[PDB]
Structure 1
């Protein structure tokens, strides 16, 4: 019953592979629904064609800024921003999907996929999903990051949607 969404990832336009996520709609329904709808594009905007702008190996891959492509944009399906729904789930290790923010109650569209345990984020970022298939593809993406987060090649969501 929890939804599954996919991203098809490309590297300088060349297909890399597919990542699928389970969204924890049973625990964070509002947050899960935002990501789901942005991944299908059903509200007329969303993730398709957007990039992963910041990738720090051994930490995380951050994306979802589909309006400015650099970490300073994005919007939710509820408006520019929405509240921190709850902090029931924790950042327990690689594969966790979590909301980026700029302060309390400032969730938009930006998210990150953790490639390490990031326990210091517990209670500050809302965890709402986890990689189900294709963690190997996230690992391959990570190799195009750097210490300061700039990517060596352009990493994009070529297609996405719901499975």
Structure 2
């Protein structure tokens, strides 16, 4: 009934930075939200702990969740290698939106991105499934390690992650 909350404990070259928490919109996109929740707890035997934000573009997004190839070519969902676009009810309205990365229609895996700007050209193409709850300051700090081309100047990792409540 209550949308779940998950956290990421972020590190910068192995040094702790802070916590980002997310509300997952299970009420609107249950299949998508459940995939991110399970990858955040690791309860399927795989997920986000230890992975990297491999592409960070200030004034756009921070992207991660490639736990199999570490660079934006990999990842897998709890349902199989890929799963369908569940719906496009939610839009990319501003900083803090959490949305699925993809490589075409119906190719969702594990990769996701946190918006740091409104990205409305992504509406109807990427599935929105959550938002930052606490720690947008930590996202902003992450964002400073990115670059125009997305290569980070320090390694930004999810040192720990799981479900709150």
Secondary structure at the residue paired with 1:85? coil
Q: Which residue is 1:55 aligned to?
A: 56
- Give the Cα–Cα distance (whole angstroms) in 2 for the partners of residues 52 and 73 of structure 1: 13
1:60 CA drift (Å): 0.1
Once the two structures are superposed, residues 105-162 of structure 1 have per-residue CA deviations (whole angstroms, 9 ceiling, x without a partner) of: 0000000000000000000000000000000000000000000000000000000000
Q: Gaps spanning 5+ residues in structure 2: where? A: none
1:33 CA drift (Å): 0.1
Secondary structure at the residue paired with 1:133? coil
1:37 CA drift (Å): 0.0
Q: Which residue is 1:70 aligned to?
A: 71
- Give the Cα–Cα distance (whole angstroms) in 2 for the partners of residues 68 and 137 of structure 1: 25
- Give the Cα–Cα distance (whole angstroms) in 2 for the partners of residues 75 and 150 of structure 1: 22
1:22 CA drift (Å): 0.1
1:62 CA drift (Å): 0.1
1:24 CA drift (Å): 0.1
Once the two structures are superposed, residues 2-44 of structure 1 have per-residue CA deviations (whole angstroms, 9 ceiling, x without a partner) of: 0000000000000000000000000000000000000000000
After the TM superposition, which parts of structure 1 deviate over 3 Å for at least 4 consecutive aligned residues? none
- Give the Cα–Cα distance (whole angstroms) in 2 for the partners of residues 124 and 73 of structure 1: 19
TM value normalised by structure 1: 1.00
1:71 CA drift (Å): 0.2
Secondary structure at the residue paired with 2:114? strand
1:51 CA drift (Å): 0.2
TM value normalised by structure 2: 0.99
1:68 CA drift (Å): 0.6
1:90-101 alignment, distance < 5 Å: 90-101=91-102
Q: Gaps spanning 5+ residues in structure 1: where? A: none
Alignment RMSD (CA, Å): 0.2
1:82 CA drift (Å): 0.1
1:75 CA drift (Å): 0.1
